[PDB]
Symmetry: D3
Subunit: 87 residues, 6 copies
């Protein structure tokens, strides 16, 4: 299915960024910064702002381990999905 394909897509993009550094299944502040700035540049306003990136990071990182795992990632998909529907 296309819907399935879009889902595997999102999953693929997650890993695309999570493997660069440290844990392969988790995103570091730095990797999330990349993901955010390159992949949602037209979705989240001011995503370019150091403060905006930090605020998003601190909020996904529910368990304070300094990493964003896949389950925490889902939150971001939901926010983004909200924006994309608004346009």
């Amino acid at each position: 299915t296309k819907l399935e394909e879009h889902l595997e897509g999102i999953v693929n993009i997650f890993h695309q960024y999570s493997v660069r550094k440290g844990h392969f299944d988790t995103l570091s502040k730095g990797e999330l910064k990349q993901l955010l700035t390159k992949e949602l540049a037209n979705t989240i306003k001011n995503i370019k702002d150091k403060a905006v990136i930090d605020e998003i990071f601190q909020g996904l990182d529910a368990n304070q381990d300094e990493q964003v795992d896949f389950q925490e990632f889902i939150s971001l998909v939901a926010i983004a999905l909200k924006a994309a529907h608004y346009h």
Copy 2:
């Protein structure tokens, strides 16, 4: 981007199903059952069974208006995304 592409895809699928009947911007049970069985067939177990479909509908429709609106639909992406990353 790609990520933005996928998210736009998801939005577009919603609407692919929501305009068939009643309100254009929301899914009725019928509409939701179509979307589930053909677009998540390989994602949610037993998704074809009547009981599962009803259970999922009853859960999304948080405000009991017998419609699944976009906000409510986000939750399903969440459930699905979970599953898709699992495979």
Copy 3:
């Protein structure tokens, strides 16, 4: 303030039904049914139907104690709020 008065309003309405029976601070299915059918009759579709009332009770009672307490009630005020704004 006006906003403070409406919030005090909702708390008072909650007690208005929670004292009828059993614990004074919680709603039983009965007390909830009365509240729903007499105070949200124009907010939630088919609120009069048995099925709907139970589905609602079954969802608010997160701890499964057969009582809806105030924190659990706040959920209902959220659904209700969505509803009112949409009508508006």
Copy 4:
């Protein structure tokens, strides 16, 4: 009914502050501070400190669009309700 009046009341108050500037349908940081400091003065601790208003704004604005829309505002009502029943 009364419960319904109170709800419509809260929606009204929302609109009373959202129409002063920018989109009519949403609350700016500024609009939000106004409502907080004169509508909730006797509900949230130290709600008259810049720090506390920032924090509430930052939390209610989940999509980071620098605006607080009605669905996001509902969370504010939840926090408030909590406080009001405590008295």
Copy 5:
């Protein structure tokens, strides 16, 4: 520490039921029925009723794969604590 001790306790108890049948690391409807009725009988009302066990299983199995995984099980702890501090 003691808190750590209790948390480890909970995980342990999860496992003592999850390994009985099927996947070792997730709970089947049967496995859960066993955990609820034996470990939570003085905590959740009417936990010995067929109907309640199922409503609790249906609720926990957020992804409809007919198993309760540790993440899903965490919500049971939340429901239970609420009750425990009540006594």
Copy 6:
């Protein structure tokens, strides 16, 4: 039963810290500080850093009353469990 004993355990630790200052039934920052660093040292990363204790305090304190009450505490239990299982 053991699970029940662990739950009660969790409630007792909470109170062990909550009775120290101000209201016996809620944790002040200071009280929360102690609890975190003495009961979760081997569970949450850098729990020792003043920045992290503050961030955790700010997240639990949903109503902004500068106390963490039992309900709000349950979120902390969930973050911790998640970690303890991961270990």
